[PDB]
Amino acid sequence: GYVPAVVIGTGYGAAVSALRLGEAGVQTLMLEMGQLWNQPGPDGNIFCGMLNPDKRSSWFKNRTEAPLGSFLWLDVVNRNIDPYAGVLDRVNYDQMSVYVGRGVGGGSLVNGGMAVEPKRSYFEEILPRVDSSEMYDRYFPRANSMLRVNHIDTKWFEDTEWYKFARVSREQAGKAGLGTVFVPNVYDFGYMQREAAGEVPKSALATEVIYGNNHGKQSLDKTYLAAALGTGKVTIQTLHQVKTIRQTKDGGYALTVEQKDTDGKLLATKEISCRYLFLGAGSLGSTELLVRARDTGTLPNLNSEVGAGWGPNGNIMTARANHMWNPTGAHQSSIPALGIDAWDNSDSSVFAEIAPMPAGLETWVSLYLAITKNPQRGTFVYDAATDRAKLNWTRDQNAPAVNAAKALFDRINKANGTIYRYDLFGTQLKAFADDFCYQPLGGCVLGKATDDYGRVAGYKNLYVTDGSLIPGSVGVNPFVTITALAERNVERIIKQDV
Numbered sequence: 001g002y003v004p005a006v007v008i009g010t011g012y013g014a015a016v017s018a019l020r021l022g023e024a025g026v027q028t029l030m031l032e033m034g035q036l037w038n039q040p041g042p043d044g045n046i047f048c049g050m051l052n053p054d055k056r057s058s059w060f061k062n063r064t065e066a067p068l069g070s071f072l073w074l075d076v077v078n079r080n081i082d083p084y085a086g087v088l089d090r091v092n093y094d095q096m097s098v099y100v101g102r103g104v105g106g107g108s109l110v111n112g113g114m115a116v117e118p119k120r121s122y123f124e125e126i127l128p129r130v131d132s133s134e135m136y137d138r139y140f141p142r143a144n145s146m147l148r149v150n151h152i153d154t155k156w157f158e159d160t161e162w163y164k165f166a167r168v169s170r171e172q173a174g175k176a177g178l179g180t181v182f183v184p185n186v187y188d189f190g191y192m193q194r195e196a197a198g199e200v201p202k203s204a205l206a207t208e209v210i211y212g213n214n215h216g217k218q219s220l221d222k223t224y225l226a227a228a229l230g231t232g233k234v235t236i237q238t239l240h241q242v243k244t245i246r247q248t249k250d251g252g253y254a255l256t257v258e259q260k261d262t263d264g265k266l267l268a269t270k271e272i273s274c275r276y277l278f279l280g281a282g283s284l285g286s287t288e289l290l291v292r293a294r295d296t297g298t299l300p301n302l303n304s305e306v307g308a309g310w311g312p313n314g315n316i317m318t319a320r321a322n323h324m325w326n327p328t329g330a331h332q333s334s335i336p337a338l339g340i341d342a343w344d345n346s347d348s349s350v351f352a353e354i355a356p357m358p359a360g361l362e363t364w365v366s367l368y369l370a371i372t373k374n375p376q377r378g379t380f381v382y383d384a385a386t387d388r389a390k391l392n393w394t395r396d397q398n399a400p401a402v403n404a405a406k407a408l409f410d411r412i413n414k415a416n417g418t419i420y421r422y423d424l425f426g427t428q429l430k431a432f433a434d435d436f437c438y439q440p441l442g443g444c445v446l447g448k449a450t451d452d453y454g455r456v457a458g459y460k461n462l463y464v465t466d467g468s469l470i471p472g473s474v475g476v477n478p479f480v481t482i483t484a485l486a487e488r489n490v491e492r493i494i495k496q497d498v
């Protein structure tokens with residue numbers, strides 16, 4: 001069971017790694033716990049929509065759940081389901097629920113495709129040891145090209161009924177002296193125009209996104225992973241979850257892997273050894289594997305930084321009630337295109353995404369998912385009893401995030417004479433959802449738990465390439481930063497180490 005290189009996971013950091021390793025001629029094996037999403041379901045489609053969720057929508061749950069913010073309208077379509085290897089996983093900790101994708105392509109399968117580059121001045125603040133010039137001149141441009149990032153046609157956007165909810169919020173924000181910015185995406189906008197014209201099968205215009213897109217979205221299986229497979233040096237094994245990592249007596253690495261079926265049944269436990277080990281299991285997946293290894297003594301040389309510095313990228317979701325004369329439209333595109341930029345690097349910094357409402361009818365609701373600058377951080381601690389890493393994060397740690405978001409939208413409300421919706425997130429009457437996370441960052445911070453290139457401190461030929469490297473915050477949607485950073489690290493690693 002020997003393979004020169006093994007990449008754990010198939011997300012952004014893992015995808016970049018596999019391609020570059022394949023191109024360099026290194027035989028690589030990717031292990032992914034989720035499924036390869038290429039089989040059509042009971043309805044003929046691969047993925048289920050948000051209006052017709054089934055077992056494909058969730059990772060081993062006994063009932064579907066309405067997307068955050070749409071409970072009042074989408075709870076009606078929920079049904080009981082058999083636990084299955086679905087695409088979206090809600091991982092619940094004490095006071096924090098983290099949503100992560102499961103399958104070949106990782107989070108790219110379930111995300112809104114927003115590809116944004118962080119402000120340079122902020123990037124320099126969060127990672128002072130990294131050369132920002134190399135990132136902005138070479139790696140970010142390289143990431144955007146390979147991801148197939150594209151821009152929306154501003155004329156179509158301005159006249160289509162599908163983005164009226166976006167234009168409405170732009171008018172409101174404008175009144176409060178705030179500005180909006182167009183956000184690039186990996187969803188083919190040209191394809192989106194043809195959807196509106198009824199020329200091609202709808203996906204983004206058919207209330208699809210969080211459980212995957214049947215068309216239009218260029219997820220990693222279509223970009224990095226397709227190219228990696230094309231090298232003839234990369235293979236991908238699905239439904240294979242890595243449990244433990246240890247170092248052989250001669251310096252190599254050995255892994256214990258559980259092969260399961262789609263129903264969760266354990267089919268076999270395998271031992272796979274390698275020379276170069278790349279971790280791309282995400283902020284949660286990589287961190288857990290490392291804290292388990294350290295605290296169970298299989299990798300006793302990991303430092304105390306492993307598991308620290310976790311942040312939810314300041315994620316806060318709020319909602320505003322529009323006046324009757326400001327309808328947002330019954331037909332709303334599932335892919336965001338506009339954002340409110342109020343990020344200046346201060347404590348009141350806010351970058352808000354104008355999120356769509358999948359209801360299908362007029363709600364007069366304007367939904368936002370704010371990204372704030374909150375210094376609070378959590379820590380992953382290993383629980384030897386249950387054999388799981390537990391996140392030590394308390395709801396009160398999100399107060400700064402809530403305050404910053406509230407400061408912004410309080411301005412918009414005052415200028416437009418509007419109020420917040422308090423009944424969208426639960427019966428608790430909360431205008432701000434502060435216990436969820438779509439963008440987990442940290443746990444194995446760059447330069448802390450690793451060197452400046454993701455080499456895990458204390459070991460040789462052991463690398464971390466994903467979201468766990470980011471120090472809890474970036475100020476914008478994270479996947480481009482994760483991809484560009486992986487480009488920077490793997491290139492250096494292949495040159496010096498491999």
Ligand SMILES: Cc1cc2nc3c(=O)[nH]c(=O)nc-3n(C[C@H](O)[C@H](O)[C@H](O)COP(=O)(O)OP(=O)(O)OC[C@H]3O[C@@H](n4cnc5c(N)ncnc54)[C@H](O)[C@@H]3O)c2cc1C
Binds near residue numbers: 104111280479
């Ligand atoms: C609803 C939603 C909306 C979002 N929208 C956006 C957006 O618009 N723009 C943006 O920039 N970002 C967005 N994100 C966040 C983005 O998806 C994540 O930041 C990104 O996917 C993180 O990349 P990663 O490489 O670190 O790990 P991930 O993409 O999470 O991938 C890790 C992979 O490793 C696998 N893995 C885990 N542990 C194991 C194990 N032990 N063995 C085997 N395999 C394992 C996982 O199953 C998974 O496939 C959103 C995410 C969600 C949930």
